[PDB]
Every structure is written in C-alpha cells, then in structure tokens.
Glr4197 protein (Gloeobacter violaceus), 1550 residues
Amino acid sequence: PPPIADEPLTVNTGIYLIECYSLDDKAETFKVNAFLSLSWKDRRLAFDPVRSGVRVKTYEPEAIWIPEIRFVNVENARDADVVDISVSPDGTVQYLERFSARVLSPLDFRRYPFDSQTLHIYLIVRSVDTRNIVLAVDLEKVGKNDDVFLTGWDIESFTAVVKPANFALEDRLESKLDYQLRISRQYFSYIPNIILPMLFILFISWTAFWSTSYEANVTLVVSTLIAHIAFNILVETNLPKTPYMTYTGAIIFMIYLFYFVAVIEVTVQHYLKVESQPARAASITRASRIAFPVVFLLANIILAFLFFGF
Amino acid sequence: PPPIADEPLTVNTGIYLIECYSLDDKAETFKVNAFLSLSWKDRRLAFDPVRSGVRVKTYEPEAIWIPEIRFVNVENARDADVVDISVSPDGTVQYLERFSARVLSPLDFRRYPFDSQTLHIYLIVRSVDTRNIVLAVDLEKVGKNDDVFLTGWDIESFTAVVKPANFALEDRLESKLDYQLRISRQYFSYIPNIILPMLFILFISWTAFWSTSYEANVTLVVSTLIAHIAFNILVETNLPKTPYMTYTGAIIFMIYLFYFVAVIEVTVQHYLKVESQPARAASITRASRIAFPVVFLLANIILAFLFFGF
Amino acid sequence: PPPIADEPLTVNTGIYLIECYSLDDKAETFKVNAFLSLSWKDRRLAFDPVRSGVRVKTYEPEAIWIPEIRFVNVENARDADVVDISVSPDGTVQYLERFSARVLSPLDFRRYPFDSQTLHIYLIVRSVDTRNIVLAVDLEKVGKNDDVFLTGWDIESFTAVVKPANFALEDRLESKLDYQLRISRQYFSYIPNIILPMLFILFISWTAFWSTSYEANVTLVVSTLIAHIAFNILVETNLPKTPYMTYTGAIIFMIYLFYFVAVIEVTVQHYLKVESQPARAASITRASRIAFPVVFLLANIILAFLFFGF
Amino acid sequence: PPPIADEPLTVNTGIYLIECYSLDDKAETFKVNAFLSLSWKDRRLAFDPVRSGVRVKTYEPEAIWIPEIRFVNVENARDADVVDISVSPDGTVQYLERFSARVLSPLDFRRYPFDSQTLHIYLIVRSVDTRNIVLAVDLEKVGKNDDVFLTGWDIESFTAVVKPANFALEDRLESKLDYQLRISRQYFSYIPNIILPMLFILFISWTAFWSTSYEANVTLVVSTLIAHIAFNILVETNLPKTPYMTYTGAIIFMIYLFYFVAVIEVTVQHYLKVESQPARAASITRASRIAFPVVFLLANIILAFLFFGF
Amino acid sequence: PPPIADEPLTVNTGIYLIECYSLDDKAETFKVNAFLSLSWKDRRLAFDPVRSGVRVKTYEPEAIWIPEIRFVNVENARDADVVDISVSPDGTVQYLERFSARVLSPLDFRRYPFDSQTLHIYLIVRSVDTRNIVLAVDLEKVGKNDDVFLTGWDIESFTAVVKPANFALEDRLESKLDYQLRISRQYFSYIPNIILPMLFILFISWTAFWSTSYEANVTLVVSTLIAHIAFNILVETNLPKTPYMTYTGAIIFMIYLFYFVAVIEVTVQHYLKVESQPARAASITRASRIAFPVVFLLANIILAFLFFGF
C-alpha cells in the first residue's frame, strides 16, 4: 500500500558508519556496520497533535508502508535490525535501521603498496504505481565514528554523491545513490618486511662481482634468486590476478632480470677465465660492480616515474 | 492451489546478473547475485480495471499461487528476497525476486592459463495436476550490468538456451532451462609470475653447459630443479585434480625432463673427464648448448600445437 | 497425531542425487544435494474422488502428519525445502523434499592414490505409539543425474540396501536404511605431479654413484633428500592421520631409507678413499649402481604386491 | 508456568553420542551430534488412563512447560530438533531432542603425540520460584554408538559424573553436570612422517663426523639444520601456543642444540687443522662420533623419563 | 510502548563472561559467550502481592516493553537467547539473556610477543520520547567464570567503566558503557619456537668468522640468511599490517643487517686475501669475532630499552 502522491516520492537516505573491517584485497570486498536513515512524507497518516496522543507517533514496520531499499554491490542481502520508526504530525516518517553487509567494490592495485582506494556503497530503489527517488540528508550522512577502524588503512572521507542516477530497468525505473569511502593504504610494514629485505638479498646477490670463485658465486647469485621467489610468492599471494601490472609486480619482475644477467655474467666471467683470457674477465666483472647498481637505480627512477609521476 | 488451465502452463523466466564474484577454480563454483523474473497467466484473478481499484494490483507471495522454481546446479537453496508481485487485469502475473546462490558448474582446465569457460545456471520446475513449461523472455534476460565484475575473468556474454529440455522425473515431468555465462580467463599475471620466472630458472639451469666444475654444476642444475618444484607446487595448488592433462601441467612436467637429462649430462661430462677422455666430454657439453634449447623450443611448438592448434 | 494402524507403518523412501561435491579427504565428509521421497498410507484422509474435488489432493506440511525422518551420519540438521505433498484417494501420501546436507562417511586410505570408496547416507526413523519401518522404492531411488559431478572422483553406482536394520534405542525402536555411493579415485594427476617428480629426484640422488667428489655428492644426495621432504609434506598435508599405513605413505617412507644408505655409502666411499684403500671404494660405488636400482624396483614389487595384490 | 512442587525439581538427563568429529587441536574444540534426554514429574498433567485416550499422551513443546537446559562450554547455542515429548499418566514427562553443538574443552599437550584427553560437556540449569537439580539416568547416558568415529583418536569411554555441582550464580542457584569423553591420541602416523624422518636427517647431520672437508660439512650440517626448521614449523603449526612445554617441543628444541654444537665442532675441527695441529683435530672429530650419539640417546632417556615416567 | 516516566530511565546492565575464545590477532577480534543482565522500573506493571498470584511474575519478551540494547563494536548482531524475565511487585523488571557475539577490539602489537591488551565490549542504547541511560550493577558484572579460557592468553580482570558516555547521535541521545577485559599474552612458546631458534641460526651465521673458505662461508652466512627469511615470514604471517613497528619486527629487521655486514665482511676478507694483503684480512675477521656479538648484544639492550624500558 504505497503513499498516494501527486508526483515522484523522495526518500531521504543517510548512512552513518559505525564499524569498518575486513578489507579483503584478494576478494575485493569490505565489511561495514552502519546506520541506515530513511525519511519520506506519507501524508496518509498525519495525526492531530492536540486531538490525541503526543508530539510524535511510534510504529512497528508492519503498520506503515516502508520503501524497499536494497544495497546494490552486496553479496547477500544486507543484514538489518530496525532501531526506530517515528511519524511526525505532517505525515513525515523517520526510519532508522542498523545494518551489516559485506560490500563488493573493485580496488586499483596499480600502485599496490602505495595505493589509495575509493570504496562504494550503492542503495537502489524500484518503483510501482508511483516513482521513487532517493537523496542524501547530509545531517544523517555524517556517517562515521571517530572510532572507525579498518586495519592497515587510513580513512580519508565518507561522503555521498548527492545526485542519484536514475535508470530504467525492466519497464520500471530505479533510483541509485553512490556513497563513497576514500581510504589510502598504510604502506610501511611493507618496507621492513618485503621491500628492505628484498633489496638486501639482491645486493648480497652481486657481492659476487668482487669474487672469482664460480662455486661460491653460483652459490651466491643462485641462493638469493631462490629467496626472491619466496618473496615473489609471499606477495603474489595476498593479491588478486589483476589484468594489468602492479608497481611491486614490476620491480619484482625487474629484479628477476638482474638475477639472470648476474648469472649470465658469473657464467661468462668463467668461460673466459678458463680460456686463458683473464685479461677480459676481470675487465667485465669490474664494470658490473658499477653497471648493475647504476642501471638498477636508474630503472627504478624510470619505473617509479612511470607509475606515480604520471 | 494451481491455476486451472486447458493445457501446459508457461512460466516466463529471465535472469539479470547484478553481481558476479568468487569463481573458485578448485571448487568449480561461482557466486551470482541476480534478478529472477517469472510471469504466467492465472486468469483466475483477472480484475475489472474500471470496476474497481487501479491499472495493476499488487500482491504478497502468500495470496497468489506462485510456481515453485528451483535452481538445479546449486549447493544450497537459492537465497531470495521478493521485490514485487504485480497482477495485470487479464490475469497476468509479474513476479520479481533478487536471489543470491553459489552455482556449481564444471570448468575445462585443458588450456588452463589460456582457457575460456561456459558457466551454467539451470532452473527446473516440476508439475502437479497441470504441466508447467519454462521459457525465456529476452527483455528480462538481458541479464548483466555494465558493472559485472568477476575478478581475473573477462565476461563475454550472458544468454539463454530458449528451448527447455523436458524430462520425466519420478512420474511427473520437469522443465529445465540453460542460462549461459561465457567467460575467458585473464592470463597475463601468469607471465610475470609463473611463466617468465619459470623459464629464467630453467635457462640458468643449463648455464651449466658452459662450465666444467661438477661442484658448481650440481649446485646449478640442482638448485634450479628445486625452485621448479616450488613453482610446480604453487600451481598444482590453485588447481583441482583433473583426470586429464592441463597445458601448463604438460610444459611443467616436460620441464622436469630437461632437469633430468641436464643432470644426466653434467654427470656424464664427468665420468668422462675423470676418465682421461676429455676428448669426448667437451664434445658432448658443446652439443647440449644447442640441443637443449632447440629441443625445448621444438617440444613447445609441438606441445603448444597439440593443445590450441588442434 | 500419527496414523492409526493395525500394525507397523511402512514409510517408503528414495533418494535422487542431484548434485555431489566437496569430498573432503581430510574431514572425511562429502556434500550432497538430492531429492527425498517419502510415501505412506494414512487412510485417515482418503477422499471420495467423485464426491468432491479432483484425482489427487495437495497439502501443506502443517495439515498432514508427516514422519520425522532424520539423516544419521550428518553434521548438522539436513537442510530441506518441501517440493510437494500429494494425497491419493486411498489415503496414500506422496511426499517430496529437496535437501542438502554434508554427510560424514569414513574413507579407506590404505591404497590412497589408487583407492575406491563406498560413501554412506543413513536415514533413521523413531517410533511412538505405533512402530515405523523404512524401505526403498527403487523407482524413486534411481537417485543420480547424468550430471553428478564430484571432482577428482569417478562415480560407480548409487544403490540402497533394501533391508533396514531395526535397533532398539532408548525404549523405542528405530528403523535405519543404508544408501550407498560407490566412487573410485581419479589417480593420474598424481603421476605428473607427485609420483613421477618424486622418482626423478631420487634418481638424480644416486647419480652420485658415478662420482668421486664428496662435496658434489653431499650436495647431490642431500639436496634431493630435501625436495623429498617437500613432497613428503605436500602429501601428508591433503590427508588425515590414519592409524594404519597408506600405500604412498609406505613408498614415501621407503624412499627415506634409500636417501640414508645413499648418504651412508657416499660417506663410506670416502673414509675409504682418504684411507689409501681406493681398492675397495670404487668397488662399493660400482655395486651400488646396480644394488640401489635393483633393490628399489624389488621393494616396490614387494610393497605393491603387499597392498593391491593381496 | 513451572510445575508447582513441594521441593527441588529433579530433571533427569542423559546424552547419547551419535556422531563425533572435528577435534580441532589448535581451537581446542570438538563437534558432537547426540541425543538429549530430559525427564521430570509435572503431576499438573497426570491423565486418567482409562477415563480417556491411551497409555501415553504426546505433546508439542509449546503446550508443556519444559526445563531450560543450556550447555555450558559451548560456542553458540546448541542446535537442536525435538524428537518426542511423551507424558506418562502419573505426570512423568519423557523429552528427547537431537542436538549438535561444537564444544569447547581444553586439551593437555604435555605428552603431545602420545597424549590422552578427557573432553567435557556440561549442561547447566537455572532456577525460578522452584529450584531445579539435574541428574543422570544411566539407561539414557549409555551415550555412544558402535559407530562413533573421531578421526585420529581412540575413544575410551563416555560416562557422567553423577553428582551435580550446585553453584549460586546471581541470586539464583544453578545445577551443573559433567559428561566426560575419554580419548587417547592415535600416535603412529607421527612416526613415518615426523619422528622417523626427523631422526634420519639428524643422523645424516653428523655423518660430518667422518669427514674432513669444511665445504662438504657445512653443506651437510647446515642443510639438515634447515630441514629440521621445516619439521619444527610443520609441527608448531597444527598445535596451539601452550604456556608449558610439549614433549615433541622438547626433543625438537633439544635437537636444535645438537645442530649447534655439531656446527661448533666442524668449525673447531678447522681452526685447528689450518693451525697445523691436526694432532688434536682428528682427535676431537673421533670422539664426537661416540659422544653425540651417546649424549643424544641419553638425553632422550632423561627427557622421555621426565615426561611419561613421572 | 515505553515506560512513562518523570525523567531519564535507568537500565541496569551487567555482563557475566561464561566463555572466551578465538582471539584472532590478524582479525583483531575475539569471541565471547556471556550473560546480559538488564533491569529497569516499569511501574506501569506493579502487581499487588497479596491481591493475586505470587511474589514475582514471569513474562515472555513480547508482553513487556524491553529496552533495545545493542553491542557497539560487534560484527553482526549479537546472538541471544532469553533466559528469564521477572517482574517485581514495585514494577522492577529483571531481564536475563545469554548472548554470543564476536567483538571487534584493536590490539597493540608494539611489544608483540610480550604484550598486554585491554579488550572492549560496548553496549549502546538509543532514546525515543523518554531518555535512557545505562549503568553497571556490579553484583551482575562479576562477569567471569573460574573457567574462562582464552588459549594463549592470561586473563587479568573483567570490570566496567561505571560512568556511561552520553553522545547525541542524529537528533536523539545515546548512552554507551565500556566493559573491559584485560589480558596479557602468554609469551613462552615463542622462545623454543621462534626466539631461540632464530638466535642459534644467527650464531652459526658468524661461525664464518673463524674460517677462511669463501665457498664454505657463503654457504654458511647465506644458508642462514634464508632460514631467517623463513622465520621472518612465519611471524609476519600470524600478525596484522600495523602502521608502527613491533618489537620482534625490530629485532627481526635488525638481524637482517647482521647478515648483510656479515656477508659484507666474508666478501671483503677475500678481495683482500686474493690481494696478497692477508696482513689485513685475518686482522678484520679477528675483530668481527668480537664486534658482531658485542654490537648485537648492545643493539638489543638499546632496542629492548627503547620499547619496554620507556
């Protein structure tokens, strides 16, 4: 029994984040616990302040007609408990639930460890014999405690795109809103745990540039190649199969090449010291000691620039 | 109380994908969040436009008789919320739910990293004292947002096999429809992370072909054999126990052989340089440097052709 | 209100497998999605064909008394949706649900990779002031689609043990039936991924039998000992702690011994070449080259025979 | 509406285990599927055998007042289905549910691989305006099928502590019972998979006691040190963070020491063979060959005794 | 229908922990099973002791108006079963549920293995046409059995912050309470399993300080570098991405440096013994044997002090 109206019914939405948690990079989902605020005029139940009762009249969800508000990018149905319905005299309804869903928003791993994201929450509504349109009441969308967590992320801003997008979908029109959570990843733990360790082993790798033993150099350059695969895997692990290239996926793959041409050198600095041409060998080896570090630091500037600086 | 009819009742189905996610290769399942659209004529409730009420009459699921529509290849019962029932004057019902199930469709790993799939969703319906037949209303089966995700997959086309397959099952007939989601895997991340790394270590492996030290060559050829097992496992891991051979499972197993005959060589190039017949040794070793790379690149063309090219 | 009867009430059961999936070897459980078919005479509601209504009368589960049928070896309560109740005029009820449980049936890992299983589904029923007995109606127990999956297994046959076993349990008798799913494991992927790789590394292991360098032989025999522990673990991992010995657990443990006496040899072939008795050393080493491979191939025939051939 | 009584109401409990499974060592929980049997006299509904109906009267849970029986050491609320309520003429109620919970009972890892456990299930009941007391009816507590599983454990005995413990808790008294499941771990798979393999690698470790090559001995003693860390981790993995010392945690940590002083030796047997004092070197090394094995086998007897023999 | 009042309604809360478990460090959540005790005066149902019935009157949740009490830092809605409602003559209600939630409280990993935590449980309440305020009745908040578990933690004290914090939230005021569980981590298992093992391998690392073989020293210093990465990973694994530095994260990262400058030394002690300047080499190496251990033990005191001692 929807509220009889002369035009499009405005439902006035507002989300207040109470808890954020479980941002699953692999899954590309997070979990929210918030307030939903709906409000619309159903004049059909305005109620004579003085004539009876009190200032405001309280209802159970069954009584009133409530607008069916669905979240769009959600796995299962939004899990909600009604907190209060309060009809104002003029026929204004104030609805308030507390829901918990896990939302499905895509992330952009392009700058992986140093990346910021904008999460989305949608809210559609479908029409019947009247149209409905959603819209934000900003006093109820200050959504966010001074307690919102989200481990390993810094929360920048919860806001809402005030103009809804109104599709037609299956011979009935729908009204969609875009709530936006802007977060930036807490890169750091990545330094002492991946980045720094990753470099160290690469440096040790080409400690083999001041050595003449094949046996000790294959042991060197190869044993580190392994440890890098370990790191390579450790990372490719907490991360989805993007169809593009991640920043660390680059520098991680680049690094693979320095292990190759290092191995290529050590190997050459040998079919050229067993050929009694050590003239040339100790010549190559010596250049390496400069070329490798320099080309690296260069490729990183090049690489780095190509990702962030553009 | 099913709608009394002179013949077979046509229910008119249509799915509109809203969300796709969690394609579990190991499990052989995905998870969908869509619209179900059913529509049938239950003349038994045609309703005098002018004589009363309005253009269309709204119902709750309890009132009307609704057809029991089950998904076939689903784990548990399809998890649904009713969005609207709308009876037309002539007795035409327009049903619309939003469901979320996880579907069980087999995948074909034969071309693994470079594979396309066709996922299925079924929908049966069983009969009573009248027969039911399902069929697609294509205006409602344009199922798919311009937002459908499915991480690590490219979505080609959501369509429906318009002719139902009508079994008899346990002295009552059923009507089944085949909805079809066609996806192709986003191979790529596999290059910088598996394929390329895998090759590199193999090349390094037979760097030992320009060396004379057993100690450094077993260190070489063997340390890489290990890293390959690492890769072998990392892969066999995100992949089910198919009874056939995968493409990468081939080239991965092939590679095992090159580590064997490499080890076989290095070993022979030694019980043949400790036998003062270095005449022959440096002869073998030299050939290897060509045979290995050539046989490989050959076996890959052979192998590759055998999978895709046929 | 159970159907008043002159003797034991026969409920007529039948399962029709629609989906099979998630056979968890570690857990010792699988997951089924089937039809349950119950049928009994409750004369207490026979209904005058001509006198009123139609051929068959449809009921909701509340109306009728339905027999409480429980699955025995199930984790939680069987998860079911009623599909139809249809009373025949003579008072014959035709019940049909579609359920989904995860069943708990023990597996026999004795021949692990090459093993067949017989899964069980039970169904009890308890009595009240009348006795109940279950029994199979084979037309409804043809349970199994031509689509039943069960990844990594071949499905042989779904049948039912027609004679129920009737316990007394807590001063009331129960009737139990045994539905039986016979599957055989799809060994194969195990070859290119475990068995073959496992052997290769063992062969390489005793490549050290045609070598004289300790340094290169400990590197050899020991580096492969590691890779075997890797395989050992990869396997002991997807497998429960059986109190008996698995087939692969045997050949995997046997293999451990060849790494020991190999290491034992290389070691001896040295405190016996540093003792200027190379007379004996190169004598031992040479025998090994035959003894190891022969004893192995022998122990496998012995072992193999002991498991399958008996 | 609780049964009016002249004193403390005795509810007569009894559990009959139907399924046991999922003993999670890490979590310290198992999962049971049993029968709960309650029985009490509610004279307030005695019922004239002859005067009406039959021998026993059947009820639905709503009618009667049933005692609220909670499990104490349970994660969530016990998950139950009522199987029968049967009132006897004298006003004796026979209740019977089938429940499934996962229980939280602490385990004692002190003898880890060779340990026995006593699991607990509790059952409280709280009072109102009458007191309740629980107690075991042993005919209904023979709880246990000849089918109870519990993979990797041997089930010794299901019994109940007949005297309840009656607390006061928050100005009302409660009655608690202790059901006890006594199981002993199936050590064995631990031998061919951890223990034996663990030892072998340790032996190989000090194969380095009959060798003179540093390069081959560091390769030896160190490569095995690694494999042990692998085992160390594989174990510390399926096991909780106990605040005491486990048996294998000991012998595993002990073993760490033999790798240290082995490494200490090999190292010393070198700054003492490069010092032209091989007099002493080959003297130490030779003693080791006896000291290590003997001290080990001794420390194990000492250790072993300290855990089991006391 | 809320209790008509002349001022702010006091609801009197109290939690009694029955079970604690599953403190997930990664997730930053634990799981509780407790009693909730609410009590308020609803004079609107005072009831004439003598005039009728008995001392206290029992209700079902539907009858009475009950205050809606929500947990704040909870994932989903608190999962509860009502245990008793008991109205006193004066109109005093005694409510008692048993709930189970999983709570979301932040942990402080700063001293990781040696850290104490204070977990939180919140409880809000929202107002309507009267205000509500929560407060602790300490006789009901002695919350905690002498059985509360929480594996791997020592439970210090369950108490409650008696003064509620009263926000205004969306034009209605709320009353929040802070229940506090104080636990300290059971460090120990960390010694025999991480700390001790970690050190040992570091010591062995610089056993290479009493050696002259590059081949054996790269084998040494590098093979341990690997094992440390293993440990590094094993730890970074059961631990969240904090934006600060953990204590073990420090000493773990510190240790990375000793492997670098160790590798730096061994390498230098060689381009300086192949340069016929062994004068200097054996000079460096000798200092190391003191500098390394001393700088370490120093850096640890420095580090340690910086974390705990401040």
Q: What stands out?
A: The radius of gyration of chain D is 30 Å. Chains D and A do not touch (no CB pair under 8 Å). Residues 1-189 of chain D form a domain with the Acetylcholine Binding Protein; Chain: A, fold (CATH 2.70.170.10). Residues 75 and 250 of chain D are 32 Å apart (CA to CA).
